[PDB]
Amino acid sequence: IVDRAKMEDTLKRRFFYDQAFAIYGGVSGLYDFGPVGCALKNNIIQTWRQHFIQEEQILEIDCTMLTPEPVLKTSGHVDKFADFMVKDVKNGECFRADHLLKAHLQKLMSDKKCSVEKKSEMESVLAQLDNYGQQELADLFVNYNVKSPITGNDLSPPVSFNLMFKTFIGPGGNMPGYLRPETAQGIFLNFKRLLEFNQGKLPFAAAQIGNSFRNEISPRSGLIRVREFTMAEIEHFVDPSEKDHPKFQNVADLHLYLYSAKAQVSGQSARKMRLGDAVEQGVINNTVLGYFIGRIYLYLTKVGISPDKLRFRQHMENEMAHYACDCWDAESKTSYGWIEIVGCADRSCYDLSCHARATKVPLVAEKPYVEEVVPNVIEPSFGLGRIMYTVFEHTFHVREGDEQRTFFSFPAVVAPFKCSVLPLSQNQEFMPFVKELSEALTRHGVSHKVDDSSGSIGRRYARTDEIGVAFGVTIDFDTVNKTPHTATLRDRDSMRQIRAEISELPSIVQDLANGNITWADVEARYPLFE
Amino acid sequence: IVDRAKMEDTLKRRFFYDQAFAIYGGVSGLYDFGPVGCALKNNIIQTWRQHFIQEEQILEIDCTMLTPEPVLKTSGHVDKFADFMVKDVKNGECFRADHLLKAHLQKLMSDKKCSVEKKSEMESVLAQLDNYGQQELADLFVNYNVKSPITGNDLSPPVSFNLMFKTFIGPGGNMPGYLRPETAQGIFLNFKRLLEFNQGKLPFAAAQIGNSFRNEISPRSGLIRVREFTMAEIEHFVDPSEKDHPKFQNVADLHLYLYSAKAQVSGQSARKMRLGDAVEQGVINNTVLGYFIGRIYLYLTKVGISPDKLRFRQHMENEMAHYACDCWDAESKTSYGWIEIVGCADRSCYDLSCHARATKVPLVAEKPYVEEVVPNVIEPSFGLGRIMYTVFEHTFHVREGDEQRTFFSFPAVVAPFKCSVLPLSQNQEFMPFVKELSEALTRHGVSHKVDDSSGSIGRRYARTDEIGVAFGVTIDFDTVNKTPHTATLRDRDSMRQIRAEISELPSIVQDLANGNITWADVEARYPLFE
Ligand SMILES: Nc1ncnc2c1ncn2[C@@H]1O[C@@H](COP(=O)(O)OP(=O)(O)OP(=O)(O)OP(=O)(O)OC[C@@H]2O[C@@H](n3cnc4c(N)ncnc43)[C@H](O)[C@H]2O)[C@H](O)[C@H]1O
Ligand SMILES: Nc1ncnc2c1ncn2[C@@H]1O[C@@H](COP(=O)(O)OP(=O)(O)OP(=O)(O)OP(=O)(O)OC[C@@H]2O[C@@H](n3cnc4c(N)ncnc43)[C@H](O)[C@H]2O)[C@H](O)[C@H]1O
């Protein structure tokens, strides 16, 4: 239970993100990222960089965003990629059908005039909605009778609005095109030279961190439903017969909630299995697909998301994307309900065969006499955009003080800046002290900023606290007069401070940030400080 | 004098960059970046990050790429942003007028049937071409008589083809739009909250590193003329009366070539002045504008560009961009002729007033009773795309060996990876040696890779050399048998190797890379090694 009001405010006011073209109304689905937003956004992508590109030796490439029609035609996006959009025959007013109807019953079932009878099946319609194809979706629009959420007029019938953007490369129009809704298409169109790198063998994974434009229909969800976002997609290319990952055991232990395709049509709550097990019972197919799920879960933990509001729901027989057959998602419970943050498909051999075909060009690899195979790609797609947002809710807190102060609890690995050094007075009796302390941290690799904004030591930290800043070091007179020189080490969450000598602090904020010492351990080694 | 053939090849073959949608023909102006390309591209942006955002405390923000018409209408892009495009009335075939004509005379003057007479003025037409407005450009198309470079048909008349891309945000078309051809527009539309950060004072600079789409007409220049590129733009906001930079003295010494607006209409060669001087004589207006020129020059040096093929040419009275009045460029001499890599405008108060107007919203700052001013922005725009390319030529070399090997000479600060450790045999008598050496480097922060590709120690380095890899460490038997254990330290450029004990090497590759020791100094401290 989080409070959107007080956060969307604290966020926007502290310029994490805010509506683009503000001074023009602001196009919905389009938001900009201020400084502390960028600092956070870069720290999330710099972690995601270790966690994957580093650890698993991932081949990186930066592909163009401007795509020519033929390429998206072959993948079959020009076709099946879109959302059902209706609209009241009064004025234009669009609406992603899907959701509109999902809001109708969420009004009936919630209204107390419901029959313990009805209520139980409208749930059976919601939990089966992404499945409903063109027809059933057209029908249901008659039944429950849908009518514009604003001034209830009469919505036309459900239609397939393609989400891709559209433009022409070069002058004229002989070369129409689109704005790549996903990155991968590029990782594949490059397959040959990407195979090349890994000596022609498999497994070998590729990747890309960049933009993807998705002209949504009714962007009303804030940072969750945007028309342009930064996402990172990995294209793990493994043998169709070797679907057995050489590391899986490092992530089988993990006990993550799972909500199989059966635990859905078999209307039952998700379970908190184990991975080494969930794969046993035939649920999570092979092991590769389970390993990435393990990592995907560690990253999401490491960056902020909390164990409790994260689950993995496989799709439904035809809730499938046009390019896959199997597939799992990382859904994060939030004020908008469970939403996916890290889609993880299993698009067997689709994409690669479709392209090799249409271009009459050969796309294969070989194994040991030596047979040719079409690798089976397993794509773990991350939408940093939403991943950041989940981190914002899961860590938002309101300190218990009538004052109404707020502090985010970001892991030291993503906070705008780890430590925030602050002295009382700004004279030369403090400088030769503050100076050192900054460089000494610099050396230790503890990202920081020296506090200048005036206010009581305590009001100063209210600011440091709002943007999640991990730790703080208070440098008062006693640090500049008493000898040894002791400073104040304050843990953002507990506002509890420590008093340690000043030249030892940098190595302390370090061990603290890296997860090489608890806050409790400090209170135990050094003296407290109310 | 560089050789495009042998490089465009070595580049593309080593997947630095290559045509996008290869297996489809490849849309010109659109290229992708392979791994060693990305590694280089990221190292250039990570340097540019220190050099500017770090040093000058630059406020960063990440703005959207999708822009709604009204915003680009107010800046006046919907109007004056474009290139003159003709086309032979036979078939479509476009052509940026500008250049087509510039290729015609570059054929007349070069053809030996020229009069020492004519030749001298066609130069007077080329050196004054960006100036020629709609008319004179229409006229000259009659004179010199321009006719399609391919199957000389008859080109229509010169017209204003707007370069911006075009699309509709949301379903319908009630909200048309474009793909931001530059970033800044965003930095301005955010002015208010950006002022806020710096306590409402000036100077204070903003910035953005991201994409910009520029639907060129005849992308035929490779990586130099692309339809989509990553660029970084800084928006330094200083007082219209304080145009005097608080650091300029740190960059006045520098002796960089300058080619004033007068040294152009006064048809005379560029000069190799000094900055503290060039500003004296009234050429380079104030000092801010000169400081950034100093930095802009250091970065371009630090990353690769060579002093000699870099100059700064101010624009011509009406070669101006629609948003500026004064302006300098960083042109880099290359196989395509001097081309600009780092545009540096002085767009006084244009952009900010235009927006504050159209939106009826107030955009100002105050100084000490306390008057309101419209800061004067000074924009240093970097096109990493072309900056990378200049680095590719300026450092391409062919080792003197009939064999035809090539090695780039990237400053250790941008090479795919600094050191490249390589052992002969792959057994356990080498591991406990290679292992250490990697971590020991890891600790020292010397990005590296262990050589696996088979071949003679020497053929191995041919590879390390092609992608510019800074240094190499050869680990042979004598390192694993003789004691002390000595390795081989090889300097990419001179192929000259050193023999030093192995546990001391990591700190050596370090000092070497950081510019804290010459290669000569090694040959002096340690023993050689043919
Ligand atoms: N029977 C059927 N036939 C055809 N289509 C059917 C169908 N049933 C359901 N559908 C679905 O309806 C469409 C709705 O798409 P979307 O509008 O993109 O939203 P989504 O389904 O909630 O995310 P998705 O799961 O598609 O993300 P993706 O794999 O592309 O890529 C990964 C995601 O990218 C990011 N992302 C996607 N959209 C985003 C947005 N608008 N804002 C921010 N991030 C976004 C997410 O963070 C990340 O998880 C889907 O394309 C299609 O699968
Ligand atoms: N009288 C007149 N009236 C109106 N317009 C006139 C004119 N006389 C000349 N012109 C010029 O004609 C147009 C040609 O533009 P472009 O097609 O973008 O090429 P340019 O002039 O060589 O680069 P420019 O100097 O414009 O780069 P910019 O400041 O935008 O931004 C910085 C640059 O971005 C990068 N960049 C720009 N285009 C690139 C491309 N196609 N590929 C790669 N990088 C590019 C460069 O690296 C970097 O220096 C210019 O917009 C306009 O000024």
- Read out DSSP for B310-378? EEE----TTT--TT-SSEE-EEE--TT-SEESEEEE---SHHHHHHHHHTT----EEE---EEE--EEE
Smallest CA–CA distance, residue A216 to chain B, in Å, is 7
CA–CA separation, B295 vs B126, rounded Å?
31
Give me the residue from A60, A71, A85 closest to B21, CB to CB: A71
User: Within a 10 A sphere around the Cβ of A462, how many other Cβ atoms?
Assistant: 16
- Residue B171 near chain A (CB below 8 Å): yes
| All residues at 6 or more sequence positions from A272 whose CB lies less than 8 Å from its CB, including other chains | A255, A256, A257, A258
Give me the residue from A32, A165, A359 closest to B24, CB to CB: A359
The technique is X-ray
CA–CA separation, A136 vs A140, rounded Å?
6
CA–CA separation, B518 vs B507, rounded Å?
14
CA–CA separation, B440 vs B401, rounded Å?
34
Cα–chain-centroid distance for residue A336?
14
Q: Tell me which residue of B382, B364, B361 sits closest to B373, measured CA to CA.
A: B364
Mutant choice from B21, B46, B448 vs A, greatest count of A C-beta within 10 A: B21
| All residues at 6 or more sequence positions from B117 whose CB lies less than 8 Å from its CB, including other chains | none
- Residue B316 near chain A (CB below 8 Å): no
Whether ligand 2 lies within 6 angstroms of the CB of B273 is answered as: no
CA–CA separation, A418 vs A43, rounded Å?
11
Report the separation in Å between the CA atom of A48 and the middle of ligand 2, taken as the mean of its atom positions. 35
Q: Which residue has the tokens 């050789």?
A: B3
Q: Which of residues 367-386 of A touch B (CB under 8 A)?
A: none
- Residue B493 near chain A (CB below 8 Å): no
Report yes or no: A178 and A64 within 8 Å, Cβ to Cβ.
no
- Residue B127 near chain A (CB below 8 Å): no
CA–CA separation, B446 vs B438, rounded Å?
9
Amino acid at B84: F
Q: Which residue has the tokens 């409208």?
A: A122
CA–CA separation, A81 vs A462, rounded Å?
46
Q: Which of residues 43-82 of B touch A (CB under 8 A)?
A: 59-68, 70-71
User: To one decimal place, what's the resolution in Å?
Assistant: 3.4
- Residue B39 near chain A (CB below 8 Å): yes
CA–CA separation, B256 vs B275, rounded Å?
7
CA–CA separation, A394 vs B507, rounded Å?
43
Whether ligand 2 lies within 6 angstroms of the CB of B331 is answered as: no
Question: B172–A94: do the CB atoms touch at under 8 Å?
Answer: yes
Give me the residue from A60, A65, A67 closest to B211, CB to CB: A65
Q: Tell me which residue of B396, B221, B384, B378 sits closest to B300, measured CA to CA.
A: B384
Beta strands in B104-258 (DSSP E): 159-162, 167-168, 176-179, 204-213, 228-238
Q: What is the DSSP string of B277-309?
A: HHTTTTSS-SSHHHHHHHHHHHHHHHTS--GGG
Q: What is the DSSP string of A421-471?
A: EEESS-STTTHHHHHHHHHHHHHHT--B----S-S-HHHHHHHHHHTT--E
Report yes or no: B289 and B378 within 8 Å, Cβ to Cβ.
yes
Give me the residue from B94, B167, B172 closest to A171, CB to CB: B94
| Alpha helix positions (H), A50-180 | 69-74, 77-80, 97-108, 118-126, 134-143
Whether ligand 2 lies within 6 angstroms of the CB of B231 is answered as: yes
User: Within a 10 A sphere around the Cβ of B484, how many other Cβ atoms?
Assistant: 10
CA–CA separation, B282 vs B277, rounded Å?
9
| All residues at 6 or more sequence positions from A216 whose CB lies less than 8 Å from its CB, including other chains | A29, A83, A96, A163, A225, A226, A227
Report the separation in Å between the CA atom of B342 and the middle of ligand 2, taken as the mean of its atom positions. 11
Cα–chain-centroid distance for residue A237?
23
Pairs from A219-225 (Cβ < 8 Å, separation ≥ 24): A219/A28, A219/A29, A219/A30, A220/A28, A221/A336, A222/A8, A222/A31, A222/A389, A223/A17, A223/A31, A223/A385, A223/A386, A223/A388, A223/A389, A223/A392, A224/A334, A224/A336, A224/A339, A224/A386, A224/A389, A225/A29
Q: Which of residues 7-36 of B touch A (CB under 8 A)?
A: 15, 18, 20-24, 27-35
| All residues at 6 or more sequence positions from A140 whose CB lies less than 8 Å from its CB, including other chains | A101, A125, A132
Segment (H or E) for A390 = helix A384-395
CA–CA separation, B188 vs B351, rounded Å?
7
Domains of chain B as residue ranges with CATH = 1-79+164-409 (3.30.930.10), 80-163 (3.30.40.230), 410-530 (3.40.50.800)
Residues of A in contact with B24 (CB under 8 A): 68, 70-71, 189, 359
CA angle B515, B520, B522 (to 5 degrees): 80
Report yes or no: B420 and B480 within 8 Å, Cβ to Cβ.
no
CA–CA separation, A74 vs A356, rounded Å?
10
Rg (CA), chain A: 26
Q: Which residues of B are annotated as a binding site?
A: 182, 214-216, 225-226, 233, 340-341, 379-381, 386
Length reported for chain A = 530
CA–CA separation, A405 vs B499, rounded Å?
62
Segment (H or E) for A44 = helix A35-45
Rg (CA), chain B: 26
How many interchain CB pairs under 8 A, A with B?
174
Q: What is the DSSP string of A199-214?
A: TT-S-EEEEEEEEEE-
Residues of B in contact with A169 (CB under 8 A): 27, 29-30, 215, 227
Report the separation in Å between the CA atom of A83 and the middle of ligand 1, taken as the mean of its atom positions. 9
Length reported for chain B = 530
Query: What residue owns the CA closest to ligand 2's atom 5?
Result: B321
- Residue A416 near chain B (CB below 8 Å): no
DSSP letter (8 states) at residue B448: B
Q: Is the peptide bond before B203 cis (omega within 30 degrees of 0)?
A: yes
| All residues at 6 or more sequence positions from B156 whose CB lies less than 8 Å from its CB, including other chains | B86, B87, B88, B89
Question: B39–A60: do the CB atoms touch at under 8 Å?
Answer: yes
Amino acid at B188: F
Quick one: which atom of ligand 2 is closest to the CA of B226?
42
- Given the DSSP bridges, would you call strands A330-332 and A339-340 parallel, antiparallel or unpaired? antiparallel
User: Within a 10 A sphere around the Cβ of A455, how many other Cβ atoms?
Assistant: 11
Report the separation in Å between the CA atom of B383 and the middle of ligand 2, taken as the mean of its atom positions. 10
3-state DSSP call for residue B480? Answer: helix
Q: What is the dihedral of CA A122, A124, A126, A132, to 10 degrees?
A: -120
User: Within a 10 A sphere around the Cβ of B223, how many other Cβ atoms?
Assistant: 19
CA–CA separation, A302 vs A308, rounded Å?
14
Segment (H or E) for B437 = helix B431-444
Q: Which residue of A has its CA nearest to B192?
A: A23
Report the separation in Å between the CA atom of B4 and the middle of ligand 1, taken as the mean of its atom positions. 44
Whether ligand 2 lies within 6 angstroms of the CB of B214 is answered as: yes
Q: Which two tokens stand for residue A246?
A: 């050489």
Report the separation in Å between the CA atom of A373 and the middle of ligand 1, taken as the mean of its atom positions. 29
Report yes or no: B366 and B212 within 8 Å, Cβ to Cβ.
no
